[PDB]
Amino acid sequence: AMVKLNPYAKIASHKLAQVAKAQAAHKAQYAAKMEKILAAKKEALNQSVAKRFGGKVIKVKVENNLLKATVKRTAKQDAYMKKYDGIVKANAKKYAEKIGF
Amino acid sequence: AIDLDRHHVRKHVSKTARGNNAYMKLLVRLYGFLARRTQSKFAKTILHRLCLSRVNRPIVSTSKLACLMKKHPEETAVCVNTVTYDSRYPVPKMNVCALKFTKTAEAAITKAGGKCLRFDELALKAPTGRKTVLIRGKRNVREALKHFGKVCAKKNPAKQYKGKQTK
Amino acid sequence: RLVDPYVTYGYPTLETVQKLIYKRGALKINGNRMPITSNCMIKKALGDKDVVCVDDLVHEIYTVGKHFKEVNNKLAPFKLNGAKIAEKNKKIHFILGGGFGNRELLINKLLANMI
RNA sequence: AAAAUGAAGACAUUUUAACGAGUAAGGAAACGAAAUGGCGUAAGGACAACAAAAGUAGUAAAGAUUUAAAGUAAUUUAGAU
RNA sequence: UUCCACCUGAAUAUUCCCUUAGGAAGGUCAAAGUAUUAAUAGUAUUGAUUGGUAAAGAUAAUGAUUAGGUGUCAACAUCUUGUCAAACUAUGAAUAAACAAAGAAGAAUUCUCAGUGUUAAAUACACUUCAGGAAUUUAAAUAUAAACAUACUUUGAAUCGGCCAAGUCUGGUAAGCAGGACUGGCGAUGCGGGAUGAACCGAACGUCGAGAUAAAGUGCCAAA
RNA sequence: UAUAAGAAAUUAUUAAGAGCAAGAGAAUUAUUUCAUUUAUAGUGAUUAUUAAUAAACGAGGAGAGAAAUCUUAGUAUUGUGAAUUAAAAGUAAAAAUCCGAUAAUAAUGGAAUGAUAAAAGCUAUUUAAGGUAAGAUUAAUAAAUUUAAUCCCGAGAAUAGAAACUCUUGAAGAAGUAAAUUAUCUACCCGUCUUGAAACACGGACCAAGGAGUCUAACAUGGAUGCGAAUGAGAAUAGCAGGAAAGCUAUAACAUGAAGAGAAAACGAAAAACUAUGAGAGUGUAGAAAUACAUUUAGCAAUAGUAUCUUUCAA
């Protein structure tokens, strides 16, 4: 009955089928990337848990760059992340002042 | 429930032939068929006027037909009512279709060279109606209408049904 | 506003208009409340108004086009189910937590359980 | 209510849509697409096995008591004594 | 004051009566029968109005009333102060009332144009189907609803003992008292809830099935 | 009369056999709906990676736990930290919880009323309207629902494909129905006056039969009927066949009407009408199915308004 009333149903159904299949792949492939990022974070944490290893001796400063890169991007994209981070910081500052009256 | 302005009650329009006249029943059967199939407003009119009560189908005299047919030489007057005879004035040549003709009216129409048709011949000859003139008689000429209302009224007094010691 | 205690109302979304017309839609044809079953019946009723399918009917209602009055007046009033009307009761305004009054865009939640 | 069909089918036709509370009160009969539809009591005129012995009845009428069936209902039908 | 089903379905205003336990005119209601129909509105908006209620005022008019200064103990003037009016009022809402939003028949323009009369005379003006007649253009002029719409005509039934509620009023100390304005109800009305109840709250009813609900509830009676 | 349809009976086998009704299922479905799960273009918060400053806060300062390797204990150095900041990671869609937004598409099981049939079903092959953040990959760039490329899928259409089933119970009594009893829910005395009665208001002990809007006469409205400037003349009455309270026939007095106004005397109707709106009939064009416009013609009924005429002191 839907097709009889609205023949455009088949055209719109196909787009819904395409997006459902495509969105599932994007979430599935994003999950794989996040597993690596979580794996990288776990390695940095477990290696820096050794701050327990050792009468205090200047406490224990831990290395700044134990987290390792997983995905690789060009230098132009590297500069864009620093641009994006500046904008999202400015927007949060822009919003916080507005509700702060 | 539902807030309706008024409930459904029978529509006050007749849709068949009043009484038990077998011939008048068949006429309504004939024009109810013609109006439904031909979809002509003339048949819908004749069908409607065939279903009125006797009081609502007033007579037409030959004098009135002559006046209405003056500028319509080759035409067929069509009145769904009895056609009486006006003995005061002459009857010219004309063709009339009517439910019933007075003995004197039928003689006068025929003697002038005209014709007296019934409604089946009219439907056989002019079903949708092509050379016809629809005619109906006057309704307010009834004497009963005089007494309606209040006779004490300032504007249009009634006529005071006569009775005991009426002056 | 005058009839506020007896009605609740708001602003529908397109999906609200779509579902109401598709499921509960009907037309007054020859004095008969004929439910919508084909585009031919819509073309017959609203062909003179350049509305020849059910999607013209939905689009015209939502955007309020030139022929809204003629299209809307042909659409018979929708008959809906029952639903949880309010929080306290329907004897107070929705602003106070009641049932009647202007619900703005929140009328779509009510219509979701009502269609 | 509106469409369609309509000399006889029949269930007072077929389809679609809306409707159905109610004291006093009203809606007489007839009217094919019927301007409400019906049940019952008694009497009068007809009809009742169509091929010249033409409704039922001593092979058990009317009535009475009950058992069942049809009808929303008024009521009707049938069995047994 | 005697059978069934179905459909529609009221009243307590107004006028008169030797009238007050009752009648006629009229309103409400039913049934018959019509008319293509200058014959839709218990609504809102825009525009021009009407009114004198609530409020407000009190050396603003008529009244009522407590004090304090200044001028010529009163008194009389003059300036402030405190409190009021159903039979006081300048001002004056909200709600309402009555119009218009294109029917001599859906507009307008142009040309021609007659009979009476007003007029000093009129070509002005008034009325005459915006007398009349002919061309061109034209369906436009808030929203919403309305063809089983609208306008009715005829004949007639019952009825005019009423009662209740209130973000109302008058008399009374007050009354489940007496009488009123507006609306909704009960009467005529069952159903679900308030234990029970003519009027309260939800909601009005052909015979049924399944679901979402309303008022209102969820320790047991009692479903949660 | 020509062709299927091709019945009943018959031959060999067995995966070897009725009708109807009730119940339980299977496959595909229509209307409504219940329960569970699942995604909903939040740029919201947390979800160990290191370091620094802190606005505030109380304290410190120099046998327990673990198989650790390190802490705890109690008899003017240091700890925590809201918030802010650096570097690393990060194209900024995982999952879980909270806060906002929603409730929809789907799936899995049911329920009430049905249906059984094939498609504007679904599926397969061809070309290609389209995919507006989002079908994908890329590139330029980017707080983008901003642009280009070539891959993918693909609506229409043409061409081909697929549905006939199981089990249980019933003349040893199925389904339904009825009667009696039981159980849960439910139920105040009928008629009447009345604003209001189950009423501490009146009539009613019980049963049968009888029991109350009828008849005559006058008028009016209305529905069916005949005739129609006439209708009636079943006015009395007079005749006919038949023997008849019935039937039929009577150029006829009269009743109502055709003429109205005036107390009466006296009178007694046309400008062969006018205006407005209005029923109906055509022709053309177009949508295109019905139907919707243009235009010619006629103007009955009804309502209203005009002249003109009869009568009246007065219309």
Side-chain angles (χ1 to χ4, degrees), chain A residues 1-55 62-101, chain B residues 1-164 166-167, chain C:
Chain A
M2 182 53 132
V3 156
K4 173 205 195 94
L5 260 167
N6 187 17
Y8 195 68
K10 284 173 181 184
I11 297 156
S13 159
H14 171 257
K15 163 168 181 13
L16 258 295
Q18 257 178 180
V19 165
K21 199 212 314 192
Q23 279 306 313
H26 283 241
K27 183 203 278 296
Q29 102 182 10
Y30 180 86
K33 172 187 99 189
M34 198 67 191
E35 293 316 286
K36 261 188 297 263
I37 303 172
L38 288 208
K41 231 177 64 189
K42 153 81 60 161
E43 198 277 338
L45 183 272
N46 248 125
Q47 159 189 135
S48 62
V49 152
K51 79 161 97 208
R52 179 153 343 280
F53 283 62
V62 182
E63 182 169 353
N64 177 91
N65 47 303
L66 309 177
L67 206 36
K68 291 341 269 160
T70 282
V71 315
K72 190 23 56 183
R73 75 195 102 264
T74 68
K76 293 179 287 191
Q77 308 185 321
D78 270 351
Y80 166 79
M81 320 213 82
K82 267 62 208 303
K83 218 221 208 183
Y84 198 77
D85 295 12
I87 280 292
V88 305
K89 192 167 276 226
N91 286 322
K93 162 166 307 153
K94 168 176 253 54
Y95 176 91
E97 160 271 290
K98 161 174 98 176
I99 63 141
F101 282 6
Chain B
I2 175 147
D3 223 1
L4 303 155
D5 43 319
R6 86 190 39 77
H7 275 88
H8 291 332
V9 180
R10 158 192 99 91
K11 182 176 290 206
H12 280 244
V13 175
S14 183
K15 291 166 285 168
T16 172
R18 323 204 94 118
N20 250 3
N21 202 344
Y23 302 91
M24 263 264 273
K25 280 286 176 188
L26 198 51
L27 258 181
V28 177
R29 262 293 192 85
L30 167 59
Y31 271 94
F33 171 84
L34 270 162
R36 170 159 31 90
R37 301 289 278 265
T38 54
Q39 314 211 73
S40 71
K41 289 186 271 148
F42 173 86
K44 297 235 184 66
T45 282
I46 299 292
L47 168 80
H48 173 83
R49 299 186 189 182
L50 271 165
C51 300
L52 307 182
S53 68
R54 171 170 144 162
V55 177
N56 293 324
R57 288 185 278 98
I59 60 181
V60 194
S61 79
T62 65
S63 282
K64 218 219 196 170
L65 287 172
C67 299
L68 300 169
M69 294 287 101
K70 205 160 288 301
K71 40 207 308 283
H72 295 116
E74 193 313 319
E75 290 274 42
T76 325
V78 177
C79 33
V80 201
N81 47 44
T82 309
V83 169
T84 61
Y85 172 46
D86 194 3
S87 44
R88 307 168 296 173
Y89 304 118
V91 202
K93 183 179 115 35
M94 84 205 117
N95 324 281
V96 194
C97 158
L99 280 180
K100 189 182 120 202
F101 283 96
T102 305
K103 301 195 281 270
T104 63
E106 198 153 21
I109 291 177
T110 285
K111 199 190 243 314
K115 271 179 56 48
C116 291
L117 303 158
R118 263 88 209 161
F119 271 104
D120 52 73
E121 328 181 35
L122 171 96
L124 180 74
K125 153 166 73 180
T128 56
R130 281 190 159 261
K131 305 304 296 317
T132 58
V133 186
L134 270 164
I135 293 171
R136 30 183 177 170
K138 308 196 70 59
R139 262 197 219 196
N140 58 7
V141 303
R142 202 158 51 106
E143 220 266 356
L145 300 207
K146 310 278 275 185
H147 306 281
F148 288 170
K150 279 147 141 235
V151 59
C152 89
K154 274 190 298 270
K155 291 324 281 183
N156 299 123
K159 219 54 65 171
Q160 203 232 36
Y161 295 118
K162 72 178 293 303
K164 174 198 172 189
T166 282
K167 84 189 89 137
Chain C
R1 147 151 85 261
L2 291 178
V3 303
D4 246 17
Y6 304 89
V7 302
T8 188
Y9 60 96
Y11 321 131
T13 69
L14 178 59
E15 313 65 345
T16 286
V17 181
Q18 283 182 1
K19 291 208 293 279
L20 261 163
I21 294 196
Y22 273 142
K23 189 156 146 43
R24 312 281 195 164
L27 291 177
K28 330 169 314 166
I29 283 167
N30 293 56
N32 296 4
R33 184 196 148 101
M34 289 281 210
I36 282 165
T37 44
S38 64
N39 289 351
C40 308
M41 92 156 264
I42 304 186
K43 175 204 201 173
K44 287 179 191 168
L46 301 155
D48 321 63
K49 305 293 165 183
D50 197 32
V51 173
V52 311
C53 88
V54 72
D55 260 40
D56 298 48
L57 174 52
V58 167
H59 165 265
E60 180 101 336
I61 292 288
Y62 178 71
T63 73
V64 192
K66 334 174 294 296
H67 304 300
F68 181 91
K69 190 225 210 299
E70 299 83 344
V71 156
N72 189 48
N73 220 13
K74 268 265 163 43
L75 228 59
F78 310 114
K79 313 169 131 177
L80 297 197
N81 214 356
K84 286 307 188 177
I85 180 54
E87 286 161 64
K88 319 289 178 203
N89 40 5
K90 68 190 190 177
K91 291 172 188 164
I92 29 182
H93 199 272
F94 177 79
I95 285 162
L96 286 165
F100 67 83
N102 195 335
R103 302 201 188 209
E104 318 235 30
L105 296 147
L106 295 175
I107 200 64
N108 311 298
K109 318 177 57 142
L110 180 72
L111 267 155
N113 293 317
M114 279 219 99
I115 292 160

